[PDB]
Design a protein around this nucleic acid. Structure first.
Ligand SMILES: [Pb+2]
Lengths: 177, 175
DNA sequence: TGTAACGCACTGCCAGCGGCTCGAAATCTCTCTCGT
DNA sequence: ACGAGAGAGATGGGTGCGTTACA
């Protein structure tokens, strides 16, 4: 399944999910705040046609990771799980008698700029940036910036601040290539 | 069982020199200056329900041995529960069963510990809720702000309370 | 460029010392009740 | 307000490869 989408339909879906996300933690069903849900992937890059829908869920405490995605719940929508772990969670939802693919990702609070930057993409862009930092003996991934296997502590909070710090010119998501 | 404050102080006075614990073969005595009486007794309450003492343990490694291997000279006591921090005993005093609670704290936790175990509950609740509104957390181990232990330049319970921004009151006047 | 989830082979190491299984033994989290 | 002890409940080899998949 997982047919194509229009950017408009994708944006419709994101807004539909903004309030209908929760997860089974012990006894309770804990709501996921809209302020901890970020739309990434092709949708954030304002692409005309989407192949899937990508959301990034900001998990506050590190211990919560093993429960959030494995026990993810959406109010009033039929979704089948293809695969699922603590970091990735590919679902198969039904939207107005259409089968679309939904991807869920997780990131802690301190890794959020690296995550947004990673999951915004596209791949070709990331390859450009990462190979550049690789040549200066660094490694960049969705968790943080590393140098000689050491996490480099950057005094940043936003994706924009991260990009400035890596020595690159900020480009809007739709213009990154 | 029940007690009077005078009976309670007498029992405390008896134990100040008769406290020890089995540490890997060696029986180490507990110093009287490291033994603090807390609870309803320190608040000079008329009638007691139990006796509460606080044992000041010097090294962090020692905590796991003191209470679980507690020793009192020449008295028959059955243990209800016990850990490294809590130790509810049931002693025999003149063929009578009274309840004894033992608590432990390290040297740097001593003012925070005394303050916690002095109580009463209602008093602790006012103080803690007040500091919580200012983005702090206070417990029997220390003062915290944003999950970071706030180092206070204090040494005594009074010094702690003044530093926390509260008017000092003797234990029987705390509510 | 960099990482995830997953089924699997090959052990390695124990509950089982032979079997790769079900679930033992021991260790975790959660919860309930307690303390001031 | 905040934390400890005990007993209930749940886990269920460790590694590392190859494949498929995510940006
Ligand atoms: Pb085995």
């Amino acid at each position: 399944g997982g047919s194509m989408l229009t950017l408009i339909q994708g944006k419709k879906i994101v807004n539909h999910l903004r309030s209908r996300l929760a997860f089974e933690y012990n006894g309770q069903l804990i709501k996921i705040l809209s302020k901890n849900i970020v739309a990434v992937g092709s949708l954030r890059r304002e692409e005309k046609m989407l192949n899937d829908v990508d959301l990034l869920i900001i998990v506050p405490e590190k211990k919560l990771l093993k429960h959030v995605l494995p026990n993810i719940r959406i109010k009033g929508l039929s979704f089948s799980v293809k695969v699922c772990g603590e970091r990735k969670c590919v679902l198969f939802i039904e939207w107005e008698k259409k089968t679309y693919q939904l991807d869920l990702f997780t990131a802690l609070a301190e890794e959020k700029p690296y995550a947004i930057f990673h999951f915004t993409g596209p791949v070709s862009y990331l390859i450009r940036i990462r190979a550049a930092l690789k040549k200066k003996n660094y490694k960049l991934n969705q968790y943080g910036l590393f140098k000689n296997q050491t996490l480099v502590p950057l005094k940043i909070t936003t994706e924009k601040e991260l990009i400035k710090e890596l020595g690159f010119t900020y480009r809007i998501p739709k213009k990154r290539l």
